[PDB]
């Protein structure tokens, strides 16, 4: 039936920069025009920017602009604010006697490019209560840093772990455009109580932060 | 006044059946197409099916098999049904005039189902403040929340009296098969031995909700 192939899945760009999406129709929509843009930010629901390919909602910033001309419809954002994070959607329709059929191209997600920011690094040991469950969780918390790209190792006894952890990291803020990030590394709780010191290490370009903790030491 | 309510999420066990109802007030029914869509935790949206203003209803090719999209004049609803799901069927439910072409466009607010293989409440410890935290500083605190299915858990600080400089983090999933999470908060450190912390965590899937104070560790 119809899809819409749209890209990039991604980019970043610093505010009061122009930023170009695009869409391809697999084939013809209806009336070569019933596309539109939507814009979706972190938790809400989708909400519809301009249709008719090029035809601006009332009330949405004039920033927004779509074009479109064969199969290939362009969404367009002239200055980008801060304010304009989100993923972004097309969706077409294609129509016939006997056919209705819609698409959404898979999204753009726009991250806002800052100055680059070094996190705040806190090491959480694992609490006597869930060490009475058998396994124990050490949170390592890069808070506030920019850019996400972050190298995150642990290290028990100076030996390097591998395949024993797994981050998360969030949305990009509201407030300083930065992220946060989780590194959890999971244990029996009998190698906890084998090996003393405990360290995550952090790396970003040419530093590295690392914060530890002796287990029992206060 | 123009509004659409989707109705009739919850809970399904894989091989169930979803029946979702989406009520339109300020307008008939029977005067537009209407769609239904859906959007699985953190992925695109996708277009179910169709119902033309005549009636006609056009699904998704991979929708056709198990599902229905019907229409009641009577009570102004169209009707989403799709049965024998499987996981990947965990969505946010959306019935929408999508507006591609026309100025009129209009989405209920979205009605979560969630097929579940397993029930499993969550267990809460804490992070708890390092006793390293700067004096007259900032100090990062919070709740780790392991071993819960399905998804979501929602996390609040006080009861939501505390929202500045929290994070709570989207969950893993985990190499058992369950979800963790933390949720983190910076404070003032010179609160720490003031201000009381406690994070609230809800999982209405195994109706549980923890609520857990969370204080400097004793030396
Ligand atoms: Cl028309
Ligand atoms: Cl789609």
């Known amino acids: 039936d119809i899809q819409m192939t749209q890209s990039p899945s991604s980019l970043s760009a610093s505010v009061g920069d122009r930023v170009t999406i695009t869409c391809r129709a697999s084939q013809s929509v209806w009336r070569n025009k019933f596309v539109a843009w939507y814009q979706q930010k972190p938790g809400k629901a989708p909400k519809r920017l301009i249709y008719?390919?090029?035809s601006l909602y009332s009330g949405v910033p004039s920033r927004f602009s779509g074009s479109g001309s064969g199969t290939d419809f362009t969404l367009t954002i002239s200055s980008l604010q801060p304010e304009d994070f989100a993923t972004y959607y097309c969706?077409?329709?294609?129509?016939?006697?006997?056919?209705?059929?819609?698409?959404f191209g898979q999204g753009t997600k726009v991250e806002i490019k800052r100055t680059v920011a070094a996190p705040s690094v806190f090491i959480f040991p694992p609490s006597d209560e869930q060490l009475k469950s058998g396994t124990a969780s050490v949170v390592c918390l890069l808070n506030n840093f920019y850019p996400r790209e972050a190298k995150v190792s642990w290290y028990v006894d100076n030996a390097l772990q591998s395949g024993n952890s797994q981050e998360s990291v969030t949305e990009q803020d509201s407030k300083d455009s930065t992220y946060s990030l989780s590194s959890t590394l999971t244990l029996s709780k009998a190698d906890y109580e084998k090996h003393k010191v405990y360290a995550c290490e952090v790396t970003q370009g040419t530093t590295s932060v690392t914060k530890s903790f002796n287990r029992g030491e206060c | 006044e123009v509004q659409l309510v989707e109705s009739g999420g919850g809970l399904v066990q894989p091989g169930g059946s979803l029946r979702l109802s989406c009520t339109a007030s300020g307008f008939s029914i029977d005067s537009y197409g209407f769609s239904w869509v859906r959007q699985a935790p953190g992925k695109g949206l996708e277009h179910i099916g169709y119902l033309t203003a005549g009636g006609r209803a056009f699904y998704a090719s991979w929708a056709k098999s198990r599902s229905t999209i019907t229409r009641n004049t009577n009570e102004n609803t169209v009707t989403l049904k799709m049965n024998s799901l499987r996981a990947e069927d965990t969505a946010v439910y959306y019935c929408?005039?999508?507006?591609?072409?026309?100025?009129?466009?209009?989405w209920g607010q979205g009605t979560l189902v969630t097929v579940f293989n397993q029930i499993k409440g969550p267990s809460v410890f804490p992070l708890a403040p390092s006793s390293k935290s700067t004096s007259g500083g900032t100090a990062a605190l919070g709740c780790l929340v392991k071993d819960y299915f399905p998804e979501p858990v929602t996390v609040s600080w006080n009861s939501g009296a505390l929202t500045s400089g929290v994070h709570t983090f989207p969950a893993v999933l985990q190499s058992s098969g369950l979800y963790s999470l933390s949720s983190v908060v910076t404070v003032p450190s010179s609160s720490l031995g003031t201000q009381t912390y406690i994070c609230n965590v809800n999982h209405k899937p195994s109706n549980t909700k923890v609520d857990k104070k969370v204080e400097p560790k004793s030396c």
């Open positions: 008719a390919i090029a």
């Open positions: 929408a005039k999508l507006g591609t072409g026309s100025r009129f466009a209009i």
């Open positions: 969706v077409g329709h294609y129509g016939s006697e006997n056919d209705a059929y819609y698409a």
